[PDB]
């Protein structure tokens, strides 16, 4: 907040950063084969098609509000069981 009074107080907000991304990882490094989508626009996705595309966990960047508008892959081999409404970690099942 008050940063004139000591100029290196201007660094501390950089320590308050969380990446807007999701972890659908099952085993600690085991990369999935999961690419599920959202029913949104491509331009709401566009950050300087209608469906969203994941990246098989590194995690994938997203709007925080673009996580309550997804749809689970009912045709995937690896289906998540814990509901993923927002970023963080959930469990997946190796089926």
């Amino acid at each position: 907040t008050q940063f004139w009074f000591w100029f290196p107080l201007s660094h501390f907000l950089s320590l308050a950063y969380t990446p807007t991304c999701v972890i659908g990882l099952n085993k600690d490094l085991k990369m999935p084969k999961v690419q599920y989508k959202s029913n949104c626009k491509p331009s709401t996705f566009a950050y300087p098609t209608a469906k969203a595309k994941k990246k098989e966990k590194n995690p994938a960047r997203v709007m925080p509000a673009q996580l309550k508008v997804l749809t689970m892959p009912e045709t995937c081999r690896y289906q998540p069981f814990k509901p993923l409404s927002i970023g963080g970690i959930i469990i997946l099942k190796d089926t």
Binding site: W4, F5, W6, F7
Partner: protein, 278 residues
């Protein structure tokens, strides 16, 4: 070396001695000194400001008699506690401020002698109770011109000191100068007692001696007839038609608060018999 925003804590006695010494210093632009303590680079508290004798030649450093200082401060040695002379002051007692040539007479002398060497410009005119009319600065070296003159580690106070949009001849002389912050430090034991002795002296009545009660109401019913008919004659001529004209002349008639407060005074001062008596 490195530069950080210098702060002038003032003794309030210094404020009093500046106003008094420049008040007596009627137009003739007196000289006096500043006698203080070296705490650091970025602050200074001044603790004592005394008087210097009037010289009618020209406001100079050569009028500063050092044995006058020796004798006066010698009397002040066992009296309280002496310190270093840390500066000086001249006066422009009618107009606001400017950076004098007296500055470039004595400022090199006192930055040779002393280190902080704060110039001080004063005026008493601009108010009587609510302003900070004194002004203070400090000469800059010519040797720092290789450095670009924009570091400052706490730029709130330069965002408060540049903020008054500096007036005329200061930034007529931004060169050979660099400004300095002057707050009024914590002086609350005096602040509360002059508040007391301002609404106990500087507002009349020493409170045993107020409780004019009647002849003021003779004059006030003169008021409350003479003001009243003029409050009557005007709003007859308000917009009694259906015009959409939009150009007012403004006089704001109303005359309410005179009636209100004066007659609260009249009723609670007619109370004085039943109040002070039984």
């Amino acid at each position: 070396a490195v530069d950080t925003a210098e702060q002038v804590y003032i003794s309030s006695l210094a404020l009093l001695k500046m106003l008094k010494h420049g008040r007596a210093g009627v137009p003739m632009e007196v000289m006096g000194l500043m006698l203080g303590e070296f705490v650091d680079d970025y602050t200074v508290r001044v603790i004592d400001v005394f008087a210097m004798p009037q010289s009618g030649t020209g406001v100079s450093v050569e009028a500063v008699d050092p044995v006058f200082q020796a004798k006066m401060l010698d009397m002040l040695k066992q009296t309280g506690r002496p310190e270093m002379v840390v500066g000086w002051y001249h006066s422009h007692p009618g107009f606001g401020c400017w950076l004098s040539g007296v500055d470039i007479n004595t400022q090199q002398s006192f930055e040779a002698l002393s280190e902080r060497a704060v110039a001080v410009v004063v005026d008493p005119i601009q108010s009587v109770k609510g302003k900070v009319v004194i002004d203070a600065f400090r000469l800059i070296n010519a040797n720092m011109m290789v450095l670009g003159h924009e570091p400052r580690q706490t730029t709130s106070n330069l965002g408060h000191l540049n903020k008054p949009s500096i007036q005329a001849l200061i930034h007529g002389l931004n060169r050979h100068y660099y400004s300095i912050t002057i707050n009024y430090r914590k002086n609350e034991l005096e602040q509360k007692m002059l508040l007391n002795l301002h609404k106990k002296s500087w507002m009349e009545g020493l409170t045993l001696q107020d409780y004019v009660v009647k002849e003021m109401l003779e004059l006030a019913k003169n008021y409350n007839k003479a003001v009243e008919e003029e409050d009557k004659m005007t709003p007859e001529q308000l917009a009694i038609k259906n015009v959409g004209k939009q150009d007012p002349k403004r006089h704001l008639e109303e005359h309410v608060d005179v009636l209100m407060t004066s007659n609260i005074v009249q009723c609670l001062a007619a109370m004085l018999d039943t109040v002070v008596f039984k």
